Every structure is written in C-alpha cells, then in structure tokens.
Design a protein around this ligand. Structure first.
Ligand SMILES: NC(=O)c1c(F)ccc(OCc2nc(-c3ccc(C(F)(F)F)cc3)c(Br)o2)c1F
Ligand SMILES: Nc1nc2c(ncn2[C@@H]2O[C@H](COP(=O)(O)OP(=O)(O)O)[C@@H](O)[C@H]2O)c(=O)[nH]1
Ligand SMILES: [Ca+2]
Length: 306
C-alpha cells in the first residue's frame, strides 16, 4: 500500500502556493483549498475546496483577525475532518500574520494529527515592511503551528530580499519560496514510489519527522569533479529557511546518482551532513542508482530535533 499524500492551502498565501503546485501538476497528491474568502476559493483550481466560517464572515476574508480564522475553522471542523480522511501524510501550507492562515492553519494541523497523519507545516513569516503587529500575530501563529504539527518549516519572507536583484519580479520571488514545499512534496512522492538500492520508506520519514519541532530541508544538485561535496553543501545551505542544520539530532538523507556513484563520494557527502550537524545524530541514509543519469548527483536532506 502506497502512502496517501495531501497538500492543504489555508488562507491567501497558502492557496497561492497550492495554485502553483496544481499548475505544475502533482499526480498522486490530493490538493485541498481552505479559505474564509469565497471569491478567492471560487477561483482555486483545487479539486477539494472548503469554505470555512460562512456564518462568521459571510463569505469574506478574516480581515487579518486570527480569532476569526480560528473560530471559522472550529465552525467547519467536520468538513475539514471529511476532506483529510484517509491521509497518511498532510502538508499544511499558510502565510502567518493574516487572519485565516494564522488562526485556521493550526486548527487544520491538529485535526490532521489526531486523524493519524504525519503532519508537516510549511509557513511564511511576514516582510518587516508589513510592520510590527503583523510580525507579532505571525509569531503567535508560528507557536500555535509548532504545537499542532509533527514538523514545521518556517520561511521568513525577508529572506526573499536576499535572493533577488532590484528588478526580480515579485511573483518570481514568490515562486522561489513556493519551491521549498513543491520539491519537498516531490521528494516524498519519489521516496514512496521508487525502490532504492539502500531503500528508504515512509516508516523512515515518520521516525525522523514524527513529533519533532523545527526542521531544515534542502536539495542539492551537482556534477563534475567535486560533485558529492558540492551537492551536500547546497542541500544543507537553505537561504530561505529560518532553521539551520547546526545541532540537528535526526537526519534523513538520500543520494540519487547514476551507475558511477562511488562509495567514496557517498561517504564524502554524508560526512558533510554529519560534520555540519555538530552532534551525536540519528541518521537514516538512503541511495538510488538511476541508470538514466550520467554525471549528475542529487542529495536530499531533512534535519530535525534541535
Ligand atoms: N533511497 C530511497 O529509497 C529513495 C528513492 F528511491 C527516491 C527518493 C528518495 O528520497 C527523496 C527524498 N525526499 C526527502 C524529503 C524528506 C522530508 C520532506 C518534508 F519535510 F516533508 F518536506 C520532503 C522530502 C528526502 Br531526505 O529524500 C529516497 F530516499
Ligand atoms: N511568500 C508569500 N507570502 C505571502 C503570499 N501571500 C501572502 N503572503 C504573506 O502571508 C501573510 C498573510 O497573508 P494572507 O495569507 O493573504 O492572509 P490570510 O488569507 O488572512 O491568511 C501576508 O502578511 C504576507 O506576508 C505569497 O503568495 N507568498
Ligand atoms: Ca523507497
């Protein structure tokens, strides 16, 4: 039996991320759009849509009030439960600092976690230009999210200002933030579908991610001379995430390479991840030999327990 994967967008930012993943097309993944705002939800491409808090907001947004988001989700608990039914893994994605995301996303997470699903949060923190109130609501939102999920990935939107030039379109910057969740979902789909030479399965994902807190995640791609060290360095250097690898107690790591993937290379990449941790780790290590690949290597890393 294959693990059932569901991705849930909660509020404006959450649903923007989901709409872009639906645009790409993820085949074995179920998408769920959750919002207070009915106009926005009507335009979603998601095949499962839940309008929350109709009695409370009359089909409008939460107007940046997290109490309205939270009570909206509590009003609609049974419809959330129904949409999540059957999930083995749930990704909850949302922008913190607004009303719907901040308030409803932790309610959604708690529902997913009590249904037995491995519950991963992927959230943003507001830009400093949005101001102190917005940042404060977001901090409370992150804390509520941390209590409700198995593992949380936090992307401060301020980090987008470190990866743009003065002309990079705003939408193109948002796509980079979006890639964290998209490549994460794809990585798990791959892990579940493909039998590895050193095989990792969904029980290995649960061991590393179940009942943790903050997580670092990344992917590194390289080829040529120093490909193993370069790939591993890129996977653990995640400029968009709040959490760094230092102090990690649990690591899931996979290397995908062609027939030339050397044992020496595998140790080099794994030593980069071990060393950067700076701890006595529980590493679960996997490898895939894809005979389609020539000189390209792909290292993927999830690091938890700080
Ligand atoms: N070695 C394998 O059995 C294997 C395979 F055949 C294909 C892909 C694969 O892993 C891809 C991968 N995906 C992840 C991963 C882990 C966590 C997350 C998160 F955090 F849920 F987003 C997302 C992706 C990792 Br670490 O590695 C394998 F381990
Ligand atoms: N990275 C990113 N952040 C967003 C996006 N849309 C909104 N945000 C952020 O998420 C916060 C909450 O906005 P929104 O999710 O639209 O409000 P909600 O609908 O009440 O949850 C905003 O303060 C922005 O910082 C997006 O598309 N990408
Ligand atoms: Ca596998």
């Amino acid at each position: 039996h294959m693990a059932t994967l569901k991705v849930i967008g909660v509020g404006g930012g959450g649903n923007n991320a989901v709409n872009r993943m639906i645009d790409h097309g993820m085949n074995n993944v179920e998408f769920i759009a959750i919002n207070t705002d009915g106009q926005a939800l009507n335009l979603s491409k998601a095949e499962s849509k839940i309008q929350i808090g109709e009695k409370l907001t009359r089909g409008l947004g939460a107007g940046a009030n997290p109490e309205i988001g939270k009570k909206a989700a509590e009003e609609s608990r049974e419809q959330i439960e129904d949409a999540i039914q059957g999930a083995d893994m749930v990704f909850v994605t949302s922008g913190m600092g607004g009303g719907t995301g901040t308030g409803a996303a932790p309610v959604v997470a708690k529902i997913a976690k009590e249904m037995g699903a491995l519950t991963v949060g992927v959230v943003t923190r507001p830009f400093s230009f949005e101001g102190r109130k917005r940042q404060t609501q977001a901090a409370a939102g992150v804390e509520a999210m941390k209590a409700a999920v198995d593992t949380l990935i936090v992307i401060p939107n301020d980090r987008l200002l470190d990866i743009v030039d003065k002309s990079t379109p705003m939408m193109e910057a948002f796509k980079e933030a979006d890639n964290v969740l998209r490549q994460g979902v794809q990585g798990i789909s791959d892990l579940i579908a493909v039998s590895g030479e050193v095989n990792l399965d969904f029980a290995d994902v649960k061991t590393i991610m179940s009942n943790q807190g903050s997580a670092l995640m990344g992917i590194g791609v390289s080829s040529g001379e120093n490909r193993a060290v370069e790939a591993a360095k890129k996977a653990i250097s995640s400029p968009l995430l709040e959490t760094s690898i230092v102090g990690a107690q649990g690591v899931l790591m996979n290397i995908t390479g062609g027939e030339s993937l050397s044992l020496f290379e595998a140790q080099e990449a794994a030593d980069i991840v071990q060393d950067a941790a700076d701890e006595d780790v529980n590493m679960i290590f996997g490898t895939v030999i894809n005979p389609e690949l020539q000189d390209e290597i792909v290292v993927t890393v999830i690091a938890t327990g700080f």
